[PDB]
Ligand binder design. Structure first.
Ligand SMILES: COc1ccc(OC(C)C)cc1Nc1cncc(-c2ccc(C(=O)O)cc2)n1
Length: 331
C-alpha cells in the first residue's frame, strides 16, 4: 500500500525558508513592458509551445530574442517567468530582459538576451576532450545554482544549452518545464524529452527532485563522449526503460523498485526481461577514444544510477577529477 517517500539529499528545505512570494507563483502579477520597443527581424526557430525571433529593441538598438508563446495556462506562464526572475544574474542562466503582449492577439512574448549560438551539429563534431569537460563544468554551475535556489529544470538536453564557442560562453535556456522543489510534493512525470527521461519518470515515481537533472546531464555526457546521439534510443517510454536496462542491467532496476515499493506497470513484465550490467568499453571505439578516459567513465557511472538518491549532486560532480584540469585553469 503506497510507494516509499523521498526527500532531496541537498537543498531540501530551501523554498520553505523563503518568503511565500518566491515560490507561490500563482500570486505573481506580471510586469508588462512596451511591445512597440521591439521590431522582429527574422524567425530563428519553432517549438512545441513557442516561436522564437531575433528582434531589435529600437530604444537602445540592442539585439534581443523574442519567444512568442502559443496558448498555455496562465499558471504555467507565471511559473516560467517567476523562475526566470528568481534565477536572473545566476551563472550561465539565460537573462529574461522583458515581457510583452501583442495588444491585439493578446499572445504573451518573453524577451531574452541574445547569444550568438554556434551550429549544434557543427559544434558537437568539433569538440575536444577538454571542451566537453569545460562546457560540462559550465552546465553544472547553472544546475547547482538553480538547485540551490529551489528550482528543478526538468528539460536538460543539448537543444536547451546555447554555446557561443567564439567567446566560450554557455547559457541554459528554456525554463518552461522548470518547477520549484518542495519536500513531499508529487510531480507530473510527463516531462522532459524521451531520450533524457530518468527512471523515476519511466516507472511513474512522482516524488522526484533535483537529481532528475543529473540523470539527464549523464545522458548528455554519454552521447558526447561516445559520439552516439542519443545514447539511450528508446522507441517509446516503455522501450526507453528497456534501452536503459540493457545497459545498467535489470538487477539494480528491481532493487530500485523494491526499495521504493513501486507498482510497476504490468506492460513492463513482457519487455523488460533480465539483462546484465554492461561495462562502458562496449561503447568505446577508435572514433570516440580520444574523448574517453577513466575519469570520464567514473564520472558518468556516478550520474547514471536508477536510485536518484545515489546520483552525484551538482557540487559533488564539480569536485570530480574529470574537472581538475578545468578548475586549475579557472584560477
Ligand atoms: C542564431 O540564434 C538562434 C537560432 C535559433 C534559435 O532557436 C531557438 C528556438 C532555440 C535560437 C537562437 N538564438 C538565441 C539567442 N539567445 C537566446 C535564445 C533563447 C532561446 C530560447 C529561450 C527559451 O526557450 O527560454 C531563451 C533564449 N536564443
Amino acid at each position: 500500500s503506497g510507494p516509499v517517500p523521498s526527500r532531496a539529499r541537498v537543498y531540501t528545505d530551501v523554498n520553505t525558508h523563503r518568503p511565500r512570494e518566491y515560490w507561490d507563483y500563482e500570486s505573481h502579477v506580471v510586469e508588462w513592458g512596451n511591445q512597440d520597443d521591439y521590431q522582429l527581424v527574422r524567425k530563428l526557430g519553432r517549438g512545441k509551445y513557442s516561436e522564437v525571433f531575433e528582434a531589435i529593441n529600437i530604444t537602445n538598438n540592442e539585439k534581443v530574442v523574442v519567444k512568442i508563446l502559443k496558448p498555455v495556462k496562465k499558471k504555467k506562464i507565471k511559473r516560467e517567468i517567476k523562475i526566470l526572475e528568481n534565477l536572473r544574474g545566476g551563472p550561465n542562466i539565460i537573462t529574461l530582459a522583458d515581457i510583452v503582449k501583442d495588444p491585439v492577439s493578446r499572445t504573451p512574448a518573453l524577451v531574452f538576451e541574445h547569444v550568438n549560438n554556434t551550429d549544434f551539429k557543427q559544434l558537437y563534431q568539433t569538440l575536444t576532450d577538454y571542451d566537453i569537460r569545460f562546457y560540462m563544468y559550465e552546465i553544472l554551475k547553472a544546475l547547482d545554482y538553480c538547485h540551490s535556489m529551489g528550482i528543478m529544470h526538468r528539460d536538460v538536453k543539448p537543444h536547451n544549452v546555447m554555446i557561443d564557442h567564439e567567446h566560450r560562453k554557455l547559457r541554459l535556456i528554456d525554463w518552461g518545464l522548470a518547477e520549484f522543489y518542495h519536500p513531499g510534493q508529487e510531480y507530473n512525470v510527463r516531462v522532459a524529452s524521451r531520450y533524457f527521461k530518468g527512471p523515476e519518470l519511466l516507472v511513474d515515481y512522482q516524488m522526484y527532485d533535483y537529481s532528475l537533472d543529473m540523470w539527464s546531464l549523464g545522458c548528455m555526457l554519454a552521447s558526447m563522449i561516445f559520439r552516439k546521439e542519443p545514447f539511450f534510443h528508446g522507441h517509446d517510454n516503455y522501450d526507453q526503460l528497456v534501452r536503459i536496462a540493457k545497459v545498467l542491467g535489470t538487477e539494480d532496476l528491481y532493487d530500485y523498485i523494491d526499495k521504493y515499493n513501486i507498482e510497476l506497470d504490468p506492460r513492463f513484465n513482457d519487455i523488460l526481461g533480465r539483462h546484465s550490467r554492461k561495462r562502458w568499453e562496449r561503447f568505446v571505439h577508435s572514433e570516440n577514444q580520444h574523448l574517453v578516459s577513466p575519469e570520464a567513465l567514473d564520472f558518468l557511472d556516478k550520474l547514471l544510477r536508477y536510485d536518484h538518491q545515489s546520483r552525484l549532486t551538482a557540487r559533488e560532480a564539480m569536485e570530480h577529477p574529470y574537472f581538475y584540469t578545468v578548475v586549475k585553469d579557472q584560477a
